Structures are given as C-alpha cells and as structure tokens.
Amino acid sequence: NKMVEYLTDWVMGTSNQAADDDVKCLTRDLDQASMEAVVSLLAGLPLQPEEGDGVELMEAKSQLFLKYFTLFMNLLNDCSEMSRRLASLRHCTVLAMSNLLNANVDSGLMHSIGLGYHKDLQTRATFMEVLTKILQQGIRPKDVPGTLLNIALLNLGSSDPSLRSAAYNLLCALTCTFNLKIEGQLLETSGLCIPANNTLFIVSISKTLAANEPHLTLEFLEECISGFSKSSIELKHLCLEYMTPWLSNLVRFCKHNDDAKRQRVTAILDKLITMTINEKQMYPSIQAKIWGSLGQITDLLDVVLDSFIKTSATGGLGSIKAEVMADTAVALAS
Amino acid sequence: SIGLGYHKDLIRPKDVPGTLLNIALLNLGSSNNTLFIVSISKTLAANEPHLTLEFLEECISGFSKSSIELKHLCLEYMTPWLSNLVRFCKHNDDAKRQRVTAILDKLITMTINEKQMYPSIQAKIWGSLGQITDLLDVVLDSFIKTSATGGLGSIKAEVMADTAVALASGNVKLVSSKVIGRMCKIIDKTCLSPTPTLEQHLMWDDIAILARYMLMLSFNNSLDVAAHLPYLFHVVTFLVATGPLSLRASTHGLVINIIHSLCTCSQLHFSEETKQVLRLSLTEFSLPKFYLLFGISKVKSAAVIAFRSETFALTSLETVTEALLEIMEACMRDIPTCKWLDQWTELAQRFAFQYNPSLQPRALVVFGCISKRVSHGQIKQIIRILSKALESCLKGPDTYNSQVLIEATVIALTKLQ
C-alpha cells in the first residue's frame, strides 16, 4: 500500500501540463500504462494506513481512501470532453476505482455514493455494477438500504440502455439481499433491452416498495430530496412521480418519541419547502403532487404548518419564501 | 371571434358552452388556484359529460399557445376529460368517427412535440387513455398510421413505439394481442404479391414499424408470453437476421426479453429444473456464438446498438430454431394442457406448402425442425417443391432464390425423415 501514495502522485501529475501534440500523446500513453499498473496493484489490496499519530483505524482509512478517490475523480472528470487515449484512459481509471472500492467495504461507499448520480452515465453504470458485486459478498448496511434504493430507482429511468440494465441488476441484488417485499419478480440478467419509457414501471416498483416495506422510509426520502436538485428536468418529473407515493409514510416517523427522528422529519420538510420555493418552472406540479398529498394526512399538519411559519420568519416579509409559502398554504389546506 | 380568449401576454351556440368553458378554465390560473380549477374540471367532466368533444378540441387547441405552467395546468385539468371519450367510440356517426380520429391525432402531435413534460404527459394522457378498452382499436390504428407516415427510424415512429409501452401498461392483453395479430396478418398478406426478399417487399415498412412495437413491449412481460409464445416464435423465425443491423439487434433483444419474461412470469408456475433450464438458456443466448447466428456480430452489446437510429444461411436458422424449440419444450414439461407446438406447427405448415419467394425457404426449414409427425402428403409436396425449384433454376435466371429453396427442401427432408 506504500507505493500507492507514490504512483498516485505520478498519476495525473501532468493531466493539464501538456503543451505539445507529441508530448500530449506520449504523456497520455504513459498515464494509460501507469493507470494499468495502479489498477493491477490495487486489485484486492487491503487499505491499511501507515501507523499514524495515535489515530483510530477509521480516521486514517477514511483520509487515505478519500485522498485516492478524489485524486482519481479529478483525473477522470478532467479526462472527458491523446484523442484516441480519451476512452482507454477513462476506462482504466474507472477500473482502478472499482478495484479500489471492491477491496474495502466499510471504508468505501461512504465517499463513493456521490458517483451514482454523477454526470458521466458510463461512470454511473460501472458504479452500480460494482455495488451489485459487493452486495453479493455474503456505514452499516442498514442505512445503505434506502440510499442505494434511491440510486437504483432513479437510474432505471435514464437515457442510456446500459445504464438502465445496470440499475435493473442493482435492484435485483438489493431486493435479493435485503429481502424487500417487491413480490420477488426481478431476476438478474445481461443483454436486457429495457424500454426507454420506464416511468410506470419505476413508479409501480416504488409504490409497492413503500407500501409493502415502509421499513426505511427516511433514508430513501432524504436521498430522493437531495438528488431531486441534482437531476435533469425529465428526471425531476420522474423523481417527483415516484417520491409522491412515499410521502404518506412520513406520518408514522413524526410522533415517535425520538429527538433524532423528529429532527430528521423536520429537515425533510424543510428541504421540501426549499424545493417548492426554488423550483418555479414546474410549480403547479410540485404543489398538487407533494403538498396536495401531504395535506390529506391529518397528523402531519401541525409539523408542516410549523415549518412553514419558521421558514416564513427566516425568509423575511416580502421575500420570495414568504409569498411562496403563503400561496402553498392554499395547496396544503385543500 | 371566440379566439381572442386565448390571448397573448396580459357558429353553433350549443358547443360554444365548451368552447367558452375552456377559456374560463385556462384563464382562472393566470397570473395558486390549480386545485380549484382541476376539481371544477373533474366535477364538470363527471356530472355534465354531454359534449366531451368540443371541449377536448378546444383544450387541445389552447394547449399549444399556453405557457409552461399553463401547460401543466392544462394537462392536469384536461386529463380527467380524456376518460369520458369512451362514450363517443361506439357511436354510429361518421362525423363523430372523424372527430375522434382528429382528436387522437392532435394528442399524438402534442405527445411528440412537448418533450419537456414527457414523463408526466405520457403517464397522464396515455396512461389513462389506455385503460378505456373501447378506444384501444382506434388508438392503435392512429399509432400505426402515424408511424407509417414517419417511417422506420423516425422521431414520430420512435415516440409511438415508446408510447405504446404506456398504452399497454393499462391493458397488456389487448394491446399485445392487437400488435401481434397485426404483424402476423401483414406477414401472411405478404403472400399475395411475392418479391424475392422481404426487404424488397412493399409491406416491409409496415413489418419494420410493427417489429419495434414488440421490442418495446417485450420487457417486463407486457406481451403476455404465456399466451402469445407461438406467434412470437413464428415472427422471430421469420425475422432472424433480416433487415438492417438495428433490426437484427432488435430481434436479438426481443428473443432475450421473451425468454426473460417467460422466466419471470408468475402466471406459469415452474419446477426448479425448468427454471434452471430457462436461466441457462438466457445465459447461453448472450454467448459470442449466437451473436454471429443472429447476424449481430462485431457489436459490443445488442441493446446499445439497438436503441438508436451479411448473407444468411439456413444452417444458422436451423440452429436458432432448434435452440428455441429446446426452450419451448423445456417450458412445456410443466404446463399440462399446453398446445403451443400444435400452434407453431400449424403456422409453419401454413407457410411451408404455399409458394413465396422469401418466406418459403425459411418456412420449410422451420417446419422440418419443429414438426413432430410427418405424413406422405408432406413428403410428396416437399419433393415436388424440389423438382419445381430445380426446373425454375434451369429456366428462370433467378438462380439464388431457386438454389436457396432447393437447399431448404433438402434440409427439410433431412430433418423430417
């Protein structure tokens, strides 16, 4: 593990220092070879930090893993958009990242969950292929449930056939491992030609998972509200569609005698209010879908109204937040 | 002069009720009364479902000129009115029929154009208009006509193929049966004006357009395989390694998806061994050999090439048909009353002994490979087919078709005997 810190410095040492076409091609070839060497070296390599300053293993492992992961992501995110090397180098980098992640289970996904949404759908596809392997090796895997379910459900309705296939295989793995009452219809496969219009299928899967398995109902909601900002408009519509079936479950985890649970519910409601205030293009959809459904449940009215009032005090009189929440009170009332 | 209600930024007197109600409903939301307007629209649609035609025409017309938020409101309060269109479906008026055709065409143009709200547009309009079992025939006919006008590989054709999944979400059996029956009917009716190959036929555009419908409806058992398996196998046998590379990949994906749906359908309970055979078949169908057998070789993945816009030998078709028959007979060990081989044998012998330039060379081999009991009439017909093909090759300049038919007859005899 010692030489990793060296060749990591060597890797992407001149990712932007090239100045000549021949120099650029030679540096790209050298980077491809070095990436191949690092990928081969990290394959199965445990992540054991050098003995630190009386530190726990968790902190040193997180620091080292984060250093390598950010180095690799900086290399790859700059590696998109020498001309022939652009694809081989990208694949070598992502293979190295996969071999790093698979080696360390409770030292990985914490900082890797942000690659699922990404911007490079090819990157995301590989990420969900990796997670499928990991979950089949028979952050604790309790909170990983909803966080992974959101990623898989969101990535089914993508615009790349490979991405949808990867997401489908991920749901197959997650349902098999976590025993979710989705009646067990999915079977893992490859070469599937998943149709592009999977809105009804994803929405039905989410509805059945919510009703049959309202076990998590919080990690999924937090992840979906977080990722609703990071998606595109069409996927914003899809995400609202399969998140509407879940907002009903928030009632049960609202009156529980836990301060952490109440704070989590309050944060979810605050994020939803912020989404309502900010997203103006699809405003009637957001109202009639989220708030028009949240109003139909009697228990959560006190919490929702209190969040409205607190955000009104924070935003200030005459501010966009005040007007938005005054109007959305009409939607909540109905 | 009623058009001024559909303003810019800030005549029978019976139907003007709806033609003015549309203006009122749209204008109520201009600059949060969306819930009120939507509820008013739903209540009017239910309690007063009298016209349901002038109002829909007016709303579709006004959707084009509205704003994005106004478009959201328009879809929201107009979706409740699409369900009531079922009443004016069995009506015995030619004018009403033309009106419904125009309305469906306008909705199709809206679905194709406004791609921003596309998930919501589909789930609201088509996800509701599918369930009305009376209007399925009209919807599918308009779909096929629009796709034909676009042609294969068109934006309209792709959008219709994608929207067929939404339509079939509601009524899987009806739409699946309609699509399969129309494709089988086109294939059969191809036997009236024979041409040397299918890609040279006049109905090839129809065949290609209807194939992608099955490709998109195959996933997640939206074709009801447990009832349409023989026709799917028949179509695949006639389509294997035919047409452009996109269609070859589509055929491969269709077979893979049909096998997957058969393996993951809950309407047919299977023993452990049968499901194991099916899973092994799905594993084998992705191997490098079958990619060459389907003609989709030197492609990394079939799905990647397929969702975008080479000579074939009868030995390959024999191998593919044998594999499919293995899967089919493996399935049949559990369904006691299954008559699938009878159906496929009937649909193969139908095309085996009737002349055609393109369907007969394939059909003879498929019949030989699939048949379970031959009789002397079949043998005599096969031998006479060989004799007539030899005579045609000797006389007619078309050497390739005659040689292929001779080879098909020889292979059919080899299997049948």
Which structure tokens are listed for B104?
């469906």
Cα separation, B160 vs B165, whole angstroms:
9
B250 CB neighbours in chain A (<8 A) are: 193
Q: Nearest 10 degrees: CA dihedral of B62, B68, B73, B76?
A: 90
CB contact under 8 A, A282 and B72: yes
Cα separation, B153 vs B155, whole angstroms:
7
> Closest-CA residue in chain A for B170?
A200
Q: Which of A186, A233, A334 sits opposite B116 (nearest CB)?
A: A233
Taking residue B151's Cβ as centre, other Cβ atoms within 10 Å add up to 12
Interface test with B, best of A164, A185, A192, A323 (most B CBs within 10 A): A192
| Longest Cα–Cα distance in chain A | 70
Cα separation, A309 vs B18, whole angstroms:
41
Contacts 24+ apart (CB under 8 A), B317-321: B317/B237, B317/B240, B317/B241, B317/B362, B317/B365, B317/B366, B318/B365, B318/B369, B318/B411, B318/B415, B319/B293, B320/B237, B320/B240, B320/B290, B320/B293, B320/B294, B321/B237, B321/B365, B321/B366, B321/B369, B321/B370
CB contact under 8 A, B123 and A199: yes
Which structure tokens are listed for B114?
């406004």
Q: CA of A122, closest CA in chain B: separation in Å?
A: 12
Q: How many residues does chain B have?
A: 417
Radius of gyration for the alpha carbons in chain B, expressed in angstroms and rounded: 26
Q: How was this structure determined?
A: cryo-EM
> Closest-CA residue in chain A for B160?
A197
A281 CB neighbours in chain B (<8 A) are: 68-69
Taking residue B154's Cβ as centre, other Cβ atoms within 10 Å add up to 17
DSSP A134-173: HHT----TTTHHHHHHHHHHHHHT-SSHHHHHHHHHHHHH
CB contact under 8 A, A284 and B76: yes
Q: CA of B255, closest CA in chain A: separation in Å?
A: 10
A324 CB neighbours in chain B (<8 A) are: none
Cα separation, A274 vs A285, whole angstroms:
15
Q: What burial letters (b/e) apply to A103-131, b meaning 16+ CB within 10 Å?
A: bbeebbbebbbebbbbebbbbbbbbbebb
Strand locations in B269-324, DSSP E? Answer: none
Q: Which of B210, B287, B224 is nearest to B256 (CA)?
A: B287
Helices then strands, counting H and E runs in chain A, come out as 16, 0
Which structure tokens are listed for B257?
């998806």
Which residue's structure tokens are 């992502």?
A94
Angle at B205 between CA B201 and CA B207, to 5 degrees: 85
Cα separation, B21 vs B48, whole angstroms:
12
Taking residue B322's Cβ as centre, other Cβ atoms within 10 Å add up to 12
Q: Which of A160, A158, A97, A168 is nearest to A128 (CA)?
A: A168
Cα separation, B231 vs B115, whole angstroms:
34
Q: Which of A159, A128, A148 is nearest to A234 (CA)?
A: A159
Q: What burial letters (b/e) apply to A305-325, b meaning 16+ CB within 10 Å?
A: eebbeebbeebeeeeebbebb
Indicate the resolution in Å.
3.4
